Amino acid sequence: QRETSCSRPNLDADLYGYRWARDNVGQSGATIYRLYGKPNAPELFLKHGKGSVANDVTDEMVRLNWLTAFMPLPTIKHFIRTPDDAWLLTTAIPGKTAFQVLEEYPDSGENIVDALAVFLRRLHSIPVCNCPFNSDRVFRLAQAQSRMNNGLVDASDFDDERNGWPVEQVWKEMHKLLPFSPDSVVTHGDFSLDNLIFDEGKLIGCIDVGRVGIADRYQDLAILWNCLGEFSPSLQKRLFQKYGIDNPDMNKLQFHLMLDEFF
């Protein structure tokens, strides 16, 4: 059947009367706009990806859409995909990042880490049978290989212990840590202090979920542990203690930190 009846059925009016600011200025990836200062309307964020980055913004859109059923996330107001562009408009989660609150309230360090650990347990508790996204080490290693071969790796942003290493050395050394035992949980993928939002003293949500998928829990623990290393070894140790691991697996920890060097 081809019913063949002639019938017939955006982003412009969604943005009426907002002030525009351009955020996260010196960071890679999508251009980020903060929309604010419109009376009687919530703050919004608008991501714009061109070229390969449009795929990244598209990845984030579908992971927001899926994961919001389980966790507190920004809400998708509008998304557009054209052959070379992606625009993602979301509601802002009010508040400050974990990083911001740690700097502003140094004495709150322990409470902040406890909250991050509990939040991480909640995410990791989502049964994997719900998750349509694969983010496992095999998938991420292939992504890392392509980024290295495409010349995209930021070799000046390596951790201190790999400062000045050629990217190829990191690649080679990382492979010596394999194989290790399979563990699969729903992960965030970039669980840094920048991507967790606190408001009025409470952890109310996470952002930047474009790498969400099934992976080793150390994908999230490692990145966060690394961030806490800017502040104190005791906050790093407390993360694992609150999460409930007796003996942090230093091999998996090192593997996932090396892997994140490529991203």
Ligand X SMILES: Cc1ccc(-c2nn(C(C)(C)C)c3ncnc(N)c23)cc1
Active site residues: 190
Where does residue 3 rank: exposed (0-12), middle (13-18), buried (19+ CB within 10 A)?
Answer: exposed
> Is residue 197 a contact point for ligand X (CB under 6 A)?
yes
Instruction: At 128, list the tokens.
Output: 């994997």
- By a kind-dependent CB cut-off of 5 to 8 A, residue 236 interacts, out of ligand X, Na ion, ligand KAN, none, with none
Instruction: At 209, list the tokens.
Output: 């979920």
- By a kind-dependent CB cut-off of 5 to 8 A, residue 97 interacts, out of ligand KAN, ligand X, Na ion, none, with ligand X
Among 41, 230, 234, 251, the residue binding ligand KAN under the rule CB under 6 A is 230
Count of beta carbons in the 10 Å neighbourhood of residue 58: 16
> Is residue 190 a contact point for ligand X (CB under 6 A)?
no
Q: What SS3 state is found at 62?
A: helix
Cis-peptide, bond into residue 132, ω within 30° of zero: no
Helix then strand then coil, % of the chain, to nearest 5: 40, 20, 40
| Closer CB to ligand X, 133 or 171, in the complex | 133
- By a kind-dependent CB cut-off of 5 to 8 A, residue 68 interacts, out of ligand X, ligand KAN, Na ion, none, with Na ion
Which span (39-47, 70-78, 118-126, 210-218) binds Na ion, by CB under 5 A? 70-78
**Residues lying near ligand KAN in the complex (CB under 6 A):** 28, 154, 157-159, 190, 192, 226-227, 229-230, 260-261, 263
